[PDB]
Amino acid sequence: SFDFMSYIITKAELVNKALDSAVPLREPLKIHEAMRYSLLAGGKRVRPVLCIAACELVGGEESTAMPAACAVEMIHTMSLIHDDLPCMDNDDLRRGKPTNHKVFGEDVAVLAGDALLSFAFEHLASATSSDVVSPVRVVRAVGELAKAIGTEGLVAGQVVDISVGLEHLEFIHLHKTAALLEASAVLGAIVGGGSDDEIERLRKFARCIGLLFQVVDDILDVTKLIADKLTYPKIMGLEKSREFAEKLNREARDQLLGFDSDKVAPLLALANYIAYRQ
Amino acid sequence: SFDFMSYIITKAELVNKALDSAVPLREPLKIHEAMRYSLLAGGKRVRPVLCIAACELVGGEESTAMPAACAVEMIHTMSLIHDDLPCMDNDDLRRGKPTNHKVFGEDVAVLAGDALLSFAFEHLASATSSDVVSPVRVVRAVGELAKAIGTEGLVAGQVVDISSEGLDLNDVGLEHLEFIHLHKTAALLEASAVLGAIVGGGSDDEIERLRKFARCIGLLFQVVDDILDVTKLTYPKIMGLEKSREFAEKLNREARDQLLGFDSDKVAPLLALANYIAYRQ
């Protein structure tokens, strides 16, 4: 009776409403319309949905986890805004409509990215209710989100993505993609009341579906600046890439043995969806 | 007797050692060299020192506030790195040295600023001692620093400044002027004093008086350097020159009045800093 598609839609639209209430437009406007433009451009919202999922699985409520979920989608948005800039990437179109700096300028773009990054923390720290989550856990959460974006996560992956073999590729993907996914699963588990063991199993899970996205997207492109030429089928061959993708989907499904029964359904569905898209 | 310069030199030197140790050269290296380059290029280090001062005044220990101080100076560094970008007030030279985006790419500059901003929070949350400072206070701190950087602080100031728009007519543009300086300079001064107070164990009342103190010397920096430059948008031309001198001495008074009630020997550095900023030639 479980519908993955119905799940993903109600969760995403719930998240979108939260993002709208969290960054209203006011005060100095150009900056807020700049933030809102990129932040409320919709999306699959996979990172916040994964964070709400991880919270529900360990027993927390959908609402406890909302500000954490908003925080990781703000980090995600900021990483894209600073990507599209001319010094890097230099793309004028994202999802059809033009990029943030092509509408407001590279100046307001850099600044809007910084504002989203800092508001992420302000929101995770202030809006997480003091009546459900102990300060200890909010502190641990902040530390994890920050670790995830810095030089052991998102930023390390972006720098290296500019300048030969397998661990170079895996490096870029563990930091650019998997680090913030890990942060999403782990934050959900933390503020949702999860135990240390549960938090480590959700970290491993997120790391696995984070690589899986990438191996599968590289396989799909041949079956129809550095991470474009360098693909898993080029390095491993196509068969070894497919075996790799099923080792990863397996390990992801096995981290979820041990949670019981009910709230594993969405995460299992997510894993299979990423694994077997066509 | 109390020696102000001896104080500021031992304190800055202490901060410098703290920052070198918090951002070592690890991998990947080019980014760590980009961060280190701007973070350890020396400087007066007034914000972290203000934060340490504020911690000691409310009863806390010097070492307690050290990660908070490193956080505010990292944030400050990012604000300089992103100030210099070509899209933003392009500056080929910072200090006397070439700018961060002129040594590494502009891309590595943007990313280094992002790594510094994030490490501020990682370091403030992770490295702050869990048995001297309660998590409740660490949470409040994360919030004050974040608020300080955002659109109610630093970034609101850098936008209304390089972005639209103000009227510089005297005496109309007066509240435009205050706005730019309350956000571009004083927001982060307020955060460092407040961080210092929060983490030193100070009460909700100490904290608001040190917040006002910091707001006053933050405005004071600006009024005084504008007064010295007459010896686009400035205090003597919007308000001054005489009304500016009285404004600067009102600000010095009020800053000195925020310190009554503390015990009179750990106020000496803050008083000295105030009088120093206030009186130049």
Q: Which residues of A touch B160 (CB under 8 A)?
A: 28
Q: Is B108 on the interface with A (CB under 8 A)?
A: yes
Q: Which chain A residue has the Cα nearest residue B162?
A: A107
Query: CB-based burial of residue B180 (10 Å sphere; 0-12 exposed, 13-18 middle, 19+ buried)?
Result: middle
Domain B1-281: which topology? Farnesyl Diphosphate Synthase (1.10.600)
Q: Which amino acid is at B7?
A: Y
DSSP chain B: ---HHHHHHHHHHHHHHHHHHHS-S-SSHHHHHHHHHHHTS----HHHHHHHHHHHHTT--TTTTHHHHHHHHHHHHHHHHHHSSTTTT--SEETTEEPHHHHS-HHHHHHHHHHHHHHHHHHHHHHS-TTTS-HHHHHHHHHHHHHHHTTTTHHHHHHHHHSS-----TTTTHHHHHHHHHHHTHHHHHHHHHHHHHHTT--TTHHHHHHHHHHHHHHHHHHHHHHHHT----HHHHT-SHHHHHHHHHHHHHHHHTTBTB-TTSSHHHHHHHHHHH---
Neighbours of B195 (CB within 10 A): 32
- Which of A110, A113, A147 comes nearest B87 by C-beta? A110
Determine phi and psi for A94, rounding to 5 degrees: -130, 115
Tell which phi-psi region holds residue A2, choosing left (phi > 0), alpha (psi between -120 and 50) or beta. beta
| Angle, CA of B107, B108 and B113, to the nearest 5° | 105
Alpha-carbon torsion (B177, B179, B185, B186), positive or negative: positive
Whether domain A1-278 has CATH 1.10.600.10: yes
The technique by which this structure was obtained is X-ray
Tell me the chain A residues in contact with residue B78 when contact means C-beta distances shorter than 8 Å. 114
Helix, coil or strand: residue A206 = helix
Resolution of the coordinates, Å: 2.8
Q: What is the DSSP letter of A259?
A: B
Size of interface A-B (CB pairs under 8 A): 146
CA geometry: angle A177, A180, A183, nearest 5 deg: 145
B26 is in an annotated binding site: no
DSSP structural state of residue A278:
-
Please indicate if any CB of chain B lies within 8 Å of the CB of A131.
Answer: no
Residue A124: name the closest of A153, A145, A98, A149 by CA. A145
Question: Which of A35, A88, A122 faces B147 most closely, judged by CB atoms?
Answer: A122
B184 has binding-site annotation:
yes
Residue A26: closest CA among chain B residues belongs to which residue? B151
Q: How many CB atoms sit inside 10 A of residue B230's CB?
A: 12
Using CA atoms, how far residue B140 sits from A22, A138, B50, in Å, is: 19, 11, 18
CB within 8 A of A256, min separation 6: which ones?
A: A201, A205, A264, A267, A268
**Do A159 and B108 count as a contact with CB atoms less than 8 A apart?**
yes
Residue B31 sits at the chain A interface (C-beta within 8 Å): yes
Q: CA-CA distance, A172 to A160, in Å (whole number)?
A: 7
Facing B150 at nearest CB: one of A88, A118, A145: A118
**Chain A residues in contact with B87 (beta carbon < 8 A):** 105-107, 109-110
CB atoms A87 and B107 under 8 Å: yes
Q: Which among A265, A101, A273 has a CA at the least distance from the CA of B110?
A: A101
Quick check: B180 contacting A, CB < 8 Å?
no
Please give the DSSP secondary-structure letter assigned to residue A257. B
Q: Say if residue B222 carries a ligand binding annotation.
A: yes
Chain B interface mutation, best of A29, A82, A107, A226, highest count of B Cβ atoms under 10 Å: A107
Tokens linked to B16:
């410098």
The tokens 């170079």 sit on which residue?
A: A168
Contacts of A151 in chain B (CB under 8 A): 26, 28, 31-32, 35, 115, 119
Q: What does B11-41 look like in DSSP terms, one character per residue? A: HHHHHHHHHHHHS-S-SSHHHHHHHHHHHTS
Q: Token pair of B205, please?
A: 């009342």
A7 interface with B at CB cutoff 8 Å: no
CB A71 within 8 A of CB A117: no
- Who contacts B201 (Cβ-Cβ below 8 Å, separation ≥6)? B58, B59, B60, B133, B137
A131: buried, middle or exposed (CB in 10 Å: 19+, 13-18, 0-12)? Answer: exposed
**A110 at interface of B, judged by CB pairs closer than 8 A:** yes
Enter the DSSP assignment of A129.
-
List binding-site positions of A for Mg(2+): 83, 89
B167 in A contact zone (CB under 8 Å) = no
What are the phi and psi torsion angles at B64 (to 5°)? Answer: -60, -40
User: What b/e readout covers A227-262, taking b as 16+ CB neighbours within 10 angstroms?
Assistant: beebbbbebbeeeebbebbeebbebbbebbeebeee
